[PDB]
Amino acid sequence: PEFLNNTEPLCNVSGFAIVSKDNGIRIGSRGHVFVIREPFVACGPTECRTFFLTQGALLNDKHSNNTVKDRSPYRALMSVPLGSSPNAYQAKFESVAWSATACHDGKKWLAVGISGADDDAYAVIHYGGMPTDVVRSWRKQILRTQESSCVCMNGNCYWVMTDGPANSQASYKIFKSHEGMVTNEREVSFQGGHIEECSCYPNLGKVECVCRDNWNGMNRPILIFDEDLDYEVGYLCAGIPTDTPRVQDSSFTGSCTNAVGGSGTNNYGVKGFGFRQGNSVWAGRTVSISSRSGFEILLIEDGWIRTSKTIVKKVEVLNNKNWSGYSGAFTIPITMTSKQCLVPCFWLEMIRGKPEERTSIWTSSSSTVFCGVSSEVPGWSWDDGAILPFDIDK
Amino acid sequence: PEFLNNTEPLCNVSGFAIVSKDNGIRIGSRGHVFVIREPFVACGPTECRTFFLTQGALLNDKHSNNTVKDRSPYRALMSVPLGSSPNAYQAKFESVAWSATACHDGKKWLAVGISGADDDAYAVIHYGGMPTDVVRSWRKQILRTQESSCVCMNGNCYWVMTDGPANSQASYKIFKSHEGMVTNEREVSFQGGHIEECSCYPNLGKVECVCRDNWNGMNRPILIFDEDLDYEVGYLCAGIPTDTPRVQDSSFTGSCTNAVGGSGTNNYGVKGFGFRQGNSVWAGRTVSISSRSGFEILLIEDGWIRTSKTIVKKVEVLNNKNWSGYSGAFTIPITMTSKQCLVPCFWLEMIRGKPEERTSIWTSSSSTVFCGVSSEVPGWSWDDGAILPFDIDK
Amino acid sequence: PEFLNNTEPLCNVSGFAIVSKDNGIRIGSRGHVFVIREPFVACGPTECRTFFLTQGALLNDKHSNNTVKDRSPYRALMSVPLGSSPNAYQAKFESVAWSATACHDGKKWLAVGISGADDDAYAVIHYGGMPTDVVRSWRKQILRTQESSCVCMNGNCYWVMTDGPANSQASYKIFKSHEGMVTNEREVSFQGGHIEECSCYPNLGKVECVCRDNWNGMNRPILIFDEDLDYEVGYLCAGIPTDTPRVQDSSFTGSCTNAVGGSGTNNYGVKGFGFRQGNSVWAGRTVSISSRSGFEILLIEDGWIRTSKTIVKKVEVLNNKNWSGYSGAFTIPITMTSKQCLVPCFWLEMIRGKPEERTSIWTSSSSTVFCGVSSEVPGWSWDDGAILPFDIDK
Amino acid sequence: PEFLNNTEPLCNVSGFAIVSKDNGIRIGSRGHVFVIREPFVACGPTECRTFFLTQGALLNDKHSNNTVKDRSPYRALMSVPLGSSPNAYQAKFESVAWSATACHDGKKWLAVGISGADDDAYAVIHYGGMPTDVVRSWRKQILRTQESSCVCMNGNCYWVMTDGPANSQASYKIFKSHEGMVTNEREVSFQGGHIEECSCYPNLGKVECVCRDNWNGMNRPILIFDEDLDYEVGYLCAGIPTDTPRVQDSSFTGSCTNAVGGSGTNNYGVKGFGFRQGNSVWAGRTVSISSRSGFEILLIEDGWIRTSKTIVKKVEVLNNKNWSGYSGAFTIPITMTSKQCLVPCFWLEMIRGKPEERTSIWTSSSSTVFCGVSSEVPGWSWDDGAILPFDIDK
């Protein structure tokens, strides 16, 4: 067992092929499957796993009542092999958590799980299944993190956390760890900007993150940092907005530096992702500009470096008649691919129940996962597929 | 870990002994078992596994409604150890798929799963659990493959795919891969012939396939190819027809070269198998000439090389009062047998529900598996055994 | 991985301590647990496992109806780790079987499973999970075997089979195998005797078996054989009868050579066991002389070599107010104990449902397991504990 | 595989961070989860596991009736990975047991399980899953042990047992074992004292235990011993009482030598724990002085060596509106932490059902687990979270 370098360039890809679909909610109509949300994927040297935040309750059970709620003492980070339902008997316990990130350094799994009261939460860092360190809330206002994979390079693992208001200026920090111990941290200066739920991946030895602005931006913040935690922060340059809510493309003008918002888009957002491709960018977004429905990915020419509106490729993986949700980035290491570059992949959360489906008492999600390939790949619509309401709703 | 040679001759066998029976539908009356169809078996160096296409739903659940349907975004290729039910908690996710093939090269599992729209489907190739390559539909008409084990020899794995009409001339291709990457392909010229759902096995360093003609043939196509993808294509010579539907043996005249059909047998078929035995052949077939009921295997003297009607052995493993379905071939590698030849085995799918059992809202199947041995073995009737209708049907 | 020698002497023990209890039927009131019977235990170098014959159906399901029946195409030999319930999700498939034996040679598991029609059954031998050989019925009358662990010594594994009438002279054979291939067999001459369901264990390089006479004997046959399959056959000498049904001890006179029966005890029996202890013997029996209720084990002074009635120790592990059933012998190898002798252990089957509990539609069993120790150990009553009837019975 | 030294000093810690929460009862509302009580945690070189005593029955099943009862033939010690629910399909069988202790010596798991009649019980010692030795009741009055992790150092494992009256002078013994064999024992002279359910941990090569006095003490006995089983015995000096029931702190005067009781606190207690910190002590207790509700941990200055009332730190992990129960100590070995000291951790049992919740027919518990860290950590209330009554209660 050796540490993964993970210092290779990110692969350039021309399409995204479906890798898995867990069908968790369909299965949970009868099987014993956790109510969850905030799923994500992370890969070790030999296996990829799906992580998720349970509600400490099962689908179609009375304890699934009121699971639209975000935080409780019953939520836990757990994982299953990629493609498995988040079920009661395969789930591996990772951390107590209502917010989390996880990744593998080549030797062991790192899991960071936040629990506790809103005004005094703390992250517990688990390494190889053992609690190694803690990070306390420094602003005492819902300490929270990525809800996707962290990044490990050369034995050091990195992640981003936020503490402070949901709809105004908050505080943003980058963390560095080795074998589960925090070894460095840096506060990111981003006045007028808002960073949450970063989707991060390694690219040529740096960590590149595409995040959620829940304040004044319908464009996505970009945060790039190195091993010293030196950073650049700004917004995805592209003249195509990729948060939700947002306005139609023709009503939007991009910015590399400033949050662009207004027009009824302020004070909300959704976790999402993008992948730099030289000067261009693959960016995901819901099909709807107002709701978490549909999902498509766009290749925007020069979209990483300028306010480009040129869409060279677009692929839809979920049509607008179906519910989506969070999306996030991860990479496949050289040990599984034998390539000289890191393969970019994304996952998609499909939320069922509240608030969009009010005749259900619960909220959960299922997922699809896609990986970049060297050729164009057709889209389709791989929807959650569950038939609501469920038994427990009647 | 080294690649399996798999270049040995196929064993000559005199009988087939039952190896496993999963009783999946009986168990799924109460247990949590996937609705499936198209099961198959493939063996690695140290383990054999049962693969299957789920419907992304469980038996006796409302989501099992309308599962007679062949393709959807919810179907997945999964696997369990040989003999296990295809259940919710042991199932290993392999690929998103409504058509599939899988095999083991000695080092890792290869799984090929087709999903997407009928007019723009694509296969995703998974190797060691990682997506490595894709194959796009080239005729834009239900790209489809074996629904049984592919063949690996000396580190290269091979499979057959079809694209085009179900009931007229289509296009047939052979694929070669190494570590999950397609390295060669060849289109098979077969004018007037139709190839689907090939059952393939290694024999003296070549791949021998017995397939389904869904057009004008009640005899089975035979496709034989080598590492260069050079091939011979034709029909099983035997003057005994082995597709379903077919006519009675006495109304049939064999052909090595031509599809023999008519008499109400055109435009359908069932996946099946055969094993060359020198110049002879073991071939499976349903007992009924018109429906998927019963199952028997026949040793036909010189049936691989001429229009022989001489049946030297016949063994029934399912009587005609019980539902059958697909059947397929696989082999056991030298690493498990210590023999100097590859052991021929077959599996049998037993379909319950629609269309034959109209009082059920669903369709699933269970399996039995048999392996060749050096002596004669008695038959019996190992039927699915489930008592229909089920709870969900009322 | 090397073959277990297993040529050590059997340990002398002064008591039996409980090792496990699976509580399978209690658990199966709600959990997903197979209907079974004929459980047994066998140990490999590093693990002991519980084997069992399922009915291919789960407790509290409609398919459990009529499971008092002994043979069907749906029965399978499966296994779980020692102490686990025989449940739907941990069970490992071993063989299709309505009669079976299994053991471990130090390198791999050997499983022998009999299925097929009563008049043409056959055993399939599985080695390392691969079908290696077959044994056909030679009398065409319910080929059957031990329903307990076989014995492996120096890489060869041995077991006993019977074919012929249940209530008159039948045919008895000993088998020798290496890596799953039958390498020798010997028919046992036993005129006027009847041998079924042998409980066998290694002792100083020979196999010692205590069996069931289902014909004229309420005393148990003893069969001892060596690697050449040379044998001695007779009855347990002790003047204490240990089959069921039997008469009270004071009405019984022992014999080393002859079946002793009559008085309403002919034509039935129950699988049981004994362990030679020098010239003495530990022998199990039901507490009731007429029914399968209660269980006790007796140390009979010189009971292996003469018609002794001297009981030096007696321990009850199940009181006569509770249902018992089959019992069987196995040993723990030196690799788990670091001893210079083989530890004798036994398991006890506790049958619930038909025929004793007529208000239930089903029959299943659970187990307790006990191992010999160097000191006296108190008894108790570890009964099945399920509360009948079950939901499905109403 | 080598034996763990475990001779390092115990770490000094300033706070306790939550490591896991199993949510077992919430999950068991629908999932298949054992009714349990007396959970505990023990760590091997590479994994921590949760152990528990089942009632041989599942939640929400009729067999859960009357599970307030402490002892039966159906109770078993089983384990799951840390954080998992004690469910029917992940549970590993360890021992038949209505009282137990378990630990890992670096090479194998040791499990000690007591079963049998109240007046003639015996412990079976399991090592590497094999029964190795027995300990008989020496006072014939409910032989019983820790219900938490034992301690292994340099290949020897130690635990404490009690036999005799629950509410008057009993007999207390320390045991030493190597590879599952008892190699030494010592009776502890403690006239007027009462020791049960010791929570023990290694500290600088000695075993330090904090126990339950069920007779005349609302203060906790302390037992410290070395490899020769030489011991010191007394009470936790602190002038803060930590048993339940107890009186308010201001009504209590500490003692290092004598049981301090009366005022309605005699003849009961609850399993609990403490950790020496130089001359100080971290000690757990229920928040309520009279009932098993709430849980807090206190750092008492010099509380190990004198009758101090100085509380320097206090952290609540369960508020007094929620049910608690047993608590216990364990340590994390150097192999998981790479530290030079042993990390102190504790678990908390949260009991639901009888006797406090009389509208339920059953009693079970779930757990939370916490580990010491080098900084202060906020508290919260991580309650069981199940909504009673359950289906089976109506």
Ligand SMILES: *[C@@H]1O[C@H](CO)[C@@H](O[C@@H]2O[C@H](CO)[C@@H](O)[C@H](O)[C@H]2NC(C)=O)[C@H](O)[C@H]1NC(C)=O
């Ligand atoms: C992905 O594509 C980008 C853009 O084409 C590649 O970046 C170029 O790399 C070459 C070779 O070093 C340089 O000469 C160019 O200056 C780069 N262009 C830009 C815009 O950065 C990159 O090499 C590709 N990555 C991989 C892994 O193939």
Ligand SMILES: *[C@@H]1O[C@H](CO)[C@@H](O[C@@H]2O[C@H](CO)[C@@H](O)[C@H](O)[C@H]2NC(C)=O)[C@H](O)[C@H]1NC(C)=O
């Ligand atoms: C299976 O049987 C076939 C037919 O008997 C065997 O093929 C023969 O092999 C011998 C030895 O090389 C040749 O002399 C013959 O010409 C072959 N006959 C035919 C019809 O091909 C084959 O060897 C057998 N296979 C195995 C593995 O034993």
Ligand SMILES: *[C@@H]1O[C@H](CO)[C@@H](O[C@@H]2O[C@H](CO)[C@@H](O)[C@H](O)[C@H]2NC(C)=O)[C@H](O)[C@H]1NC(C)=O
């Ligand atoms: C079990 O007990 C028997 C009977 O006491 C032991 O058999 C004796 O072994 C000694 C030593 O070789 C011989 O001198 C005696 O002749 C034997 N007696 C009989 C009746 O066989 C045997 O050694 C013991 N087994 C073990 C493993 O300790």
Ligand SMILES: *[C@@H]1O[C@H](CO)[C@@H](O[C@@H]2O[C@H](CO)[C@@H](O)[C@H](O)[C@H]2NC(C)=O)[C@H](O)[C@H]1NC(C)=O
């Ligand atoms: C935990 O704290 C205690 C108390 O401060 C430490 O014990 C001291 O150790 C030093 C160094 O050997 C001695 O000089 C003192 O006499 C000790 N004091 C007492 C009260 O025992 C102990 O070293 C600490 N343990 C660890 C692992 O850091």
Ligand SMILES: CC(=O)N[C@H]1[C@H]([C@H](O)[C@H](O)CO)OC(C(=O)O)=C[C@@H]1NC(=N)N
């Ligand atoms: C820690 C916390 O509760 N995180 C929130 C998150 C949050 O409200 C926004 O980012 C605003 O700050 O939004 C949402 C969301 O669906 O919008 C889900 C999260 N749920 C959980 N991760 N549990």
Ligand SMILES: CC(=O)N[C@H]1[C@H]([C@H](O)[C@H](O)CO)OC(C(=O)O)=C[C@@H]1NC(=N)N
């Ligand atoms: C891809 C596709 O849908 N394949 C079909 C197959 C097909 O219709 C025929 O071969 C004709 O082309 O027939 C049948 C069949 O039962 O006849 C099952 C298959 N179901 C699936 N593999 N899902």
Ligand SMILES: CC(=O)N[C@H]1[C@H]([C@H](O)[C@H](O)CO)OC(C(=O)O)=C[C@@H]1NC(=N)N
């Ligand atoms: C193969 C067969 O059916 N074996 C029988 C066995 C048998 O009837 C007697 O030994 C008489 O021959 O008896 C019994 C028994 O409970 O008496 C259970 C067995 N059930 C099974 N092993 N399935």
Ligand SMILES: CC(=O)N[C@H]1[C@H]([C@H](O)[C@H](O)CO)OC(C(=O)O)=C[C@@H]1NC(=N)N
């Ligand atoms: C062996 C036995 O039954 N141990 C008891 C224990 C005991 O009654 C007291 O310590 C008094 O002696 O108390 C309690 C308790 O909840 O107070 C649970 C235990 N339950 C079990 N471990 N099963």
Ligand SMILES: *[C@@H]1O[C@H](CO)[C@@H](O)[C@H](O)[C@H]1NC(C)=O
């Ligand atoms: C969910 O909560 C609401 C409000 O308390 C209640 O009316 C409803 O019955 C609950 N559903 C269940 C299944 O408990």
Ligand SMILES: *[C@@H]1O[C@H](CO)[C@@H](O)[C@H](O)[C@H]1NC(C)=O
């Ligand atoms: C299955 O579908 C049919 C037609 O939509 C419907 O009538 C029937 O009730 C469905 N069954 C279930 C269990 O939903």
Ligand SMILES: *[C@@H]1O[C@H](CO)[C@@H](O)[C@H](O)[C@H]1NC(C)=O
């Ligand atoms: C079991 O079989 C009997 C006889 O056929 C029948 O009367 C009874 O209803 C059956 N029970 C179930 C649950 O099917």
Ligand SMILES: *[C@@H]1O[C@H](CO)[C@@H](O)[C@H](O)[C@H]1NC(C)=O
């Ligand atoms: C539990 O036991 C009581 C007393 O015997 C009984 O009244 C009650 O119905 C039982 N509950 C169940 C589910 O059997």
Ligand SMILES: [Ca+2]
């Ligand atoms: Ca926004």
Ligand SMILES: [Ca+2]
């Ligand atoms: Ca046809």
Ligand SMILES: [Ca+2]
């Ligand atoms: Ca008899």
Ligand SMILES: [Ca+2]
């Ligand atoms: Ca007390």
